Design an enzyme around this catalytic site. Sequence first.
Site, PDB file in Angstrom:
ATOM      1  N   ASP A  54      13.480  15.629  30.376  1.00 26.35           N
ATOM      2  CA  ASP A  54      13.659  16.700  29.394  1.00 26.35           C
ATOM      3  C   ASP A  54      14.065  17.925  30.206  1.00 26.35           C
ATOM      4  O   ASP A  54      13.744  18.012  31.392  1.00 26.35           O
ATOM      5  CB  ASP A  54      12.342  17.019  28.686  1.00 26.35           C
ATOM      6  CG  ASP A  54      12.061  16.104  27.512  1.00 26.35           C
ATOM      7  OD1 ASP A  54      12.896  15.225  27.195  1.00 26.35           O
ATOM      8  OD2 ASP A  54      10.989  16.274  26.901  1.00 26.35           O
ATOM      9  N   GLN A  78       1.561  10.283  29.593  1.00 26.07           N
ATOM     10  CA  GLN A  78       1.523  11.532  28.844  1.00 26.07           C
ATOM     11  C   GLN A  78       0.203  12.302  29.050  1.00 26.07           C
ATOM     12  O   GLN A  78      -0.867  11.823  28.702  1.00 26.07           O
ATOM     13  CB  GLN A  78       1.783  11.227  27.362  1.00 26.07           C
ATOM     14  CG  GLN A  78       2.584  12.294  26.643  1.00 26.07           C
ATOM     15  CD  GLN A  78       1.704  13.274  25.912  1.00 26.07           C
ATOM     16  OE1 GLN A  78       0.568  13.527  26.316  1.00 26.07           O
ATOM     17  NE2 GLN A  78       2.226  13.844  24.829  1.00 26.07           N
ATOM     18  N   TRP A 136      -1.757  14.491  27.692  1.00 27.24           N
ATOM     19  CA  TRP A 136      -2.803  14.522  26.664  1.00 27.24           C
ATOM     20  C   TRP A 136      -3.587  13.243  26.388  1.00 27.24           C
ATOM     21  O   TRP A 136      -4.764  13.305  26.033  1.00 27.24           O
ATOM     22  CB  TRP A 136      -2.221  15.004  25.326  1.00 27.24           C
ATOM     23  CG  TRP A 136      -1.762  16.428  25.359  1.00 27.24           C
ATOM     24  CD1 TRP A 136      -0.540  16.896  25.759  1.00 27.24           C
ATOM     25  CD2 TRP A 136      -2.565  17.581  25.094  1.00 27.24           C
ATOM     26  NE1 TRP A 136      -0.536  18.272  25.766  1.00 27.24           N
ATOM     27  CE2 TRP A 136      -1.768  18.719  25.362  1.00 27.24           C
ATOM     28  CE3 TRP A 136      -3.887  17.765  24.657  1.00 27.24           C
ATOM     29  CZ2 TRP A 136      -2.249  20.024  25.212  1.00 27.24           C
ATOM     30  CZ3 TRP A 136      -4.366  19.060  24.509  1.00 27.24           C
ATOM     31  CH2 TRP A 136      -3.545  20.176  24.786  1.00 27.24           C
ATOM     32  N   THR A 142      -0.781   7.822  19.819  1.00 25.20           N
ATOM     33  CA  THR A 142       0.054   8.209  18.688  1.00 25.20           C
ATOM     34  C   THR A 142       1.310   7.340  18.611  1.00 25.20           C
ATOM     35  O   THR A 142       2.434   7.840  18.583  1.00 25.20           O
ATOM     36  CB  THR A 142       0.460   9.708  18.744  1.00 25.20           C
ATOM     37  OG1 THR A 142       1.139   9.990  19.976  1.00 25.20           O
ATOM     38  CG2 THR A 142      -0.762  10.594  18.613  1.00 25.20           C
ATOM     39  N   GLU A 167      10.415   8.801  21.617  1.00 24.73           N
ATOM     40  CA  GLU A 167       9.215   8.526  22.394  1.00 24.73           C
ATOM     41  C   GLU A 167       8.464   7.352  21.782  1.00 24.73           C
ATOM     42  O   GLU A 167       7.806   6.572  22.479  1.00 24.73           O
ATOM     43  CB  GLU A 167       8.298   9.744  22.443  1.00 24.73           C
ATOM     44  CG  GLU A 167       7.136   9.562  23.410  1.00 24.73           C
ATOM     45  CD  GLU A 167       6.322  10.818  23.564  1.00 24.73           C
ATOM     46  OE1 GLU A 167       5.521  11.137  22.656  1.00 24.73           O
ATOM     47  OE2 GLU A 167       6.496  11.494  24.601  1.00 24.73           O
TER      48      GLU A 167
END
EC number: 2.4.1.87
Lengths: 278, 281
Positions: free
Chosen positions: A144, A166, A168, A178, A236
Site C-alpha cells: 500500500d 495484520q 490488530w 474478519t 484483503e
Amino acid sequence: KLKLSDWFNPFKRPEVVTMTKWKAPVVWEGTYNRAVLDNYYAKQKITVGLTVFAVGRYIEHYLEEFLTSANKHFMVGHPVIFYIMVDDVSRMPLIELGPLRSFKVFKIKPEKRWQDISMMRMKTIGEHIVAHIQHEVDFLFCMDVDQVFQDKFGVETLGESVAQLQAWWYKADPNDFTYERRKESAAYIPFGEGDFYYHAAIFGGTPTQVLNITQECFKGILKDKKNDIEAQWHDESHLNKYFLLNKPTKILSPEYCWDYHIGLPADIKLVKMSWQTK
Amino acid sequence: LKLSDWFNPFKRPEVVTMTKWKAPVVWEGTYNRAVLDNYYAKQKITVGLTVFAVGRYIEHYLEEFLTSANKHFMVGHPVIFYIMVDDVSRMPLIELGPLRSFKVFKIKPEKRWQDISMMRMKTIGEHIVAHIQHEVDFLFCMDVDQVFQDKFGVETLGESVAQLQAWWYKADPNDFTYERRKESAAYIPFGEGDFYYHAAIFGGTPTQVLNITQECFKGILKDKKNDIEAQWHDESHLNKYFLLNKPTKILSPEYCWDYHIGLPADIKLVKMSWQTKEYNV
Ligand SMILES: O=c1ccn([C@@H]2O[C@H](COP(=O)(O)OP(=O)(O)O[C@H]3O[C@H](CO)[C@H](O)[C@H](O)[C@H]3F)[C@@H](O)[C@H]2O)c(=O)[nH]1
Ligand SMILES: O=c1ccn([C@@H]2O[C@H](COP(=O)(O)OP(=O)(O)O[C@H]3O[C@H](CO)[C@H](O)[C@H](O)[C@H]3F)[C@@H](O)[C@H]2O)c(=O)[nH]1
Ligand SMILES: [Mn+2]
Ligand SMILES: [Mn+2]
C-alpha cells in the site's frame, strides 16, 4: 541452497509464534541473520521489485514519503526497482534515489470507486508481471502507498510467497478473524477454518507466485461482481481466502507493518514499517 | 569470449575493421549480435547510460533521446538510464519498456554551454564512485542531442569504447581538429593521432570510464589555470586521452551519423543520428 537453520533462530523470540503448523517461518525481530542472507543473496545477484499505487490525493499525501523511506530501508545493499503506478504522472514526485535503486513510472486509469482502485491493483500487477516484471526481478513485493518504512526491511523477508500478519488480529483466534463469512462470496472462509489474518497492505514472493496470487484474487473479485456481492474487506478478503488454500512459505510479524495507533506492546521489538495516520 | 566468435571483418573490406593496436572497428554487417546476446545474457550483465539535459536541451532532445534509447539500446538486457538535468520539473517521464529503468539527478546549471559540456566529465565520475560502479558492468556516456535510429546492441560493449566522428573517419590525421596549442593539456602534435573520436558517445566498464572522465576533467581544470580553453573542449581532452590510452573497441560512424553529410556507401545502417541544433530553413 539455503537452509532455515542457516539464518533463522526462533528461540530468540519464544513469546510469539515463530513457526506455522505447516513448517512456514514467521520472521520476528531478533530471529533472523540478515548478514548471512545478504551474503547468500548477493552471491546470486538477485533483484527485488516493489509495486506501489498512488491514485488521487494519495500521490501528494503518501507517494513521496513512501519512496523516500523505501529507497532508504528496502533491501539495502541489493538492486531494487520501484514500479510507480499513478493516474497523474505529471504529479509524481521525483525524489533522488540512492545506490542500487532505480524506478519506472506507469500511467494507469483511475477507478471512480475507491474500492475498485484498491482491488484493480490485482489485475494491473498481473499484467505488468507478465509484460516485464517476471524478466527483471527474482522477488517482488506489492505494498500500500500509505505506509512508511521506519527501519531495515531486508532480504530476511524474501521467499516463494510471503504474507504479512495484520497488526490488530495477530493474537486473536481464527473464529474472530474478519474473514468474509458469506458463502455467496468467492472470498468465503467457513468458521472453524483459517490460520492467520493477513494484511493486504504487504504481500509478495517470486514473480510466478505473485501472479497466481493476484490472478486468483482478481477472478474472485470479478466473480463477486457478477453475483452482485462484494467481500467485506475487498481484495484483503480474497487475499486471505487465497492464502488459506495456498499457504505462504513465509510470514512477516506485525513488526513489518505496525499500527502505532495500537500503541507499542512487548511483542513489537523493532518496527520496520508503520501505517500512515490517514 | 573470443573476437572470432562474433567479429568478422571480411564482411566490410572497403573500410578499416581493425586498428594497429588490434582494437576492432564495429561496422554494420561485421557483428553477430545473436551470439553476443547469449554470452552476455548468461553473464547477467547490466548496462548503464548517462545523459545530460540543461536548459533548452531538455525540451528539444531529452524526450526523443530516451524514447529511442528505450527502444533500441541494449534490447534484451537490463538497462539503467542516468538522467542529469538542471530542472527536474521539466524532466519528461516517458513510459519505459521491459528491462529499462532510471533515476534523475538535479545538477547545477553552468552559465557557459562550454562549461555544461565539460562538467559532465566531473559529474559522471562522482556518480561512478557513488553508485554506478555498483550497478552496471558497462556504462555509456552520450550527448542528448541525438536519437537512436536502430539497434545499438551489446556488440558495442568493451573495456573502453570510442566513437568515430562522422566527418573525419576518412580524413588525414593532420587535418583533424585536435587542440594544436602546446599550452593546452589536450594538445596533440601534428604527425600524431589515430582517429578523431566523437565526444558525443564514449563508454566502457565503470572503472575505465572513471579514468577517462577523471583524466579529461583534470586537463580541463589545468587549462582554466593557464587561461586557455581547448578549441573543442572536452572532445579535445578525450581525443588526447584516447591517444595515450587507446580504446579496446571503436564504433563506425554508423553508430553516430550526421545526415547533413548525406549518406555515403559506407553507412550501411545508421544506429544513431545527430539531432539538428538550429532551424536554418
Ligand atoms: O483514493 C485512493 C484509494 C486507494 N488507493 C490505493 O489502494 C491502497 C489501499 O487503500 P486504502 O489505503 O485506502 O485502504 P486500507 O488502509 O483500508 O487498506 C486495507 O484494505 C484495503 C481494501 O479496503 C486493501 O486490501 C489494502 O491492501 C489493505 F491494507 C492504497 O494504499 C493506495 O495505494 C489510491 O491510490 N487512491
Ligand atoms: O545548453 C546546453 C548545452 C550543452 N548541453 C549538454 O552538453 C552536450 C554537448 O553539447 P552540444 O551537443 O551542444 O555540443 P556538440 O554537438 O557541438 O558536441 C561536441 O562538442 C562538445 C564540446 O563543444 C562535446 O565534446 C560533445 O560531446 C561533442 F560531441 C549536450 O548534448 C548536452 O548533453 C546541455 O545540456 N545544455
Ligand atoms: Mn492502506
Ligand atoms: Mn551534441
